[PDB]
């Protein structure tokens, strides 16, 4: 349980994501890789853009082939496209193994690229059925598994930041692990904890309970994974199902009430500030989200605090000042367990048993009074059916899976 070369192999800028070197081509060309477990396409820079000073160039390598296919994908904020081939790619602080993968080289983009990010590219981790063009197009992590001996598993350990923040100018900068093929024992404390993988597509996962200071929210339970819950590492927020949204910020507006903060706090967009060091911590509440256990009527909870769902931003003006933005918002696409989440744990991602395991992270952010807690179990008699099963277009239906 120790994986001493691939502890300490991301980096990053608060709020723009966790980045993991990695090598293309032959010779090989280094870049900066987004680990992503929201996606599943490896898709790298490979032209020249205003936010980059380095990019994949196919001239340059001798083993790169051309699949003769393009690809399109468009989401929310915009999209990148390009071309479709395949390469040698390494992981330098990762396995000592080199596998052939798909690669995407993207030629254009709109509003996929982060200004000041550090990053060229992004691993897409989750599964072949969210792939584009079509699930055809294996993932990263199957080649790596299919073509050598690394085990089907890795782990994550996303270190998040916190005041005094050296720079006034730029973003705080954030590290963290991606163990490759096992568990390392020396990033975590305590028990760790499994909820299953509902299905292999994105990292879905089954919220059956969530308490806002130890208070039930007592929803339908569906309501917690309408029309899904994710675990993914290319969010930054905790993001929440309308409904659910609304009733967490009515519970921690009412903890927190003796600071009127403006409305643009709550929605994300505005900061709040305190005198250096005298941040109320203790006003705001912690949330637990209890996650399906891997025995029937069986969960466990992790518990946040708002060292985590609060996000340190150092203002120019306002150096004098701590300041803050509400890290949680509304999605009407499922609950999204974010960097938000995954900043409090040892997340594992246990592809070969179908789950997903949590223990406190020994790098989480925390104060004298209360900790990020993973806790267990918790027995439910009879334990209701909290998923959601999201109507079937025709179009999925007439999809044939050969
Ligand atoms: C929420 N989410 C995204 O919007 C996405 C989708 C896609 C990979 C297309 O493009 C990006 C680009 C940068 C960042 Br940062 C995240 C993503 N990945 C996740 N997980
Ligand atoms: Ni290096
Ligand atoms: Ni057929």
Request: glycine share 8%.
């Amino acid at each position: 349980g120790s994986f001493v070369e691939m502890v300490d192999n991301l980096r990053g800028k608060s709020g723009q994501g966790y980045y993991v070197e990695m090598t293309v081509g032959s010779p090989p060309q280094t870049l900066n890789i987004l680990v992503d477990t929201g996606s599943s396409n490896f898709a790298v820079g490979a032209a020249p853009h205003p936010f980059l000073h380095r990019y994949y160039q196919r001239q340059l390598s001798s083993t790169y082939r051309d699949l003769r296919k393009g690809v399109y994908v468009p989401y929310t904020q915009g999209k990148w496209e390009g071309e479709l081939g395949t390469d040698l790619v390494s992981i330098p602080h990762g396995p000592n193994v080199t596998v052939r993968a798909n690669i995407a080289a993207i030629t254009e983009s709109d509003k996929f690229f982060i200004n000041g990010s550090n990053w060229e590219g992004i691993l897409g981790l989750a599964y072949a059925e969210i792939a584009r063009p079509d699930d055809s197009l294996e993932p990263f992590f199957d080649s790596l598994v299919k073509q050598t001996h690394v085990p089907n598993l890795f782990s994550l350990q996303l270190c998040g930041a916190g005041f005094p923040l050296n720079q006034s100018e730029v973003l705080a900068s954030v590290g963290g692990s991606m163990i490759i093929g096992g568990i390392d024992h020396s990033l975590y404390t305590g028990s760790l904890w499994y909820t299953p993988i509902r299905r292999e597509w994105y990292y879905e996962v089954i919220i059956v309970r969530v308490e806002i200071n130890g208070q039930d929210l007592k929803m339908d339970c569906k309501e917690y994974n309408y029309d899904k819950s994710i675990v993914d590492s290319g969010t930054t927020n905790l993001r929440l199902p309308k409904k659910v949204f609304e009733a967490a910020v009515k519970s921690i507006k009412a903890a927190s009430s003796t600071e009127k903060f403006p409305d643009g706090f709550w929605l994300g967009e505005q900061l709040v500030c305190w005198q250096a060091g005298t941040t109320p911590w203790n006003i705001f509440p912690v949330i637990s989200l209890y996650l399906m256990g891997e025995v029937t009527n069986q969960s466990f909870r992790i518990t946040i605090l708002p060292q985590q769902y609060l996000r340190p931003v150092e203002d120019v003006a306002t150096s004098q000042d701590d300041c803050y933005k509400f890290a949680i918002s509304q999605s009407s696409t499922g609950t999204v367990m974010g960097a938000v989440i995954m900043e409090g744990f040892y997340v594992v991602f246990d592809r070969a048993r179908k789950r997903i395991g949590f223990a406190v992270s020994a790098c989480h952010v925390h104060d004298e009074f209360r900790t990020a807690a993973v806790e267990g179990p918790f027995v439910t008699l009879d334990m209701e059916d909290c998923g959601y099963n999201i109507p079937q277009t025709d179009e999925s239906r007439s999809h044939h899976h050969h």
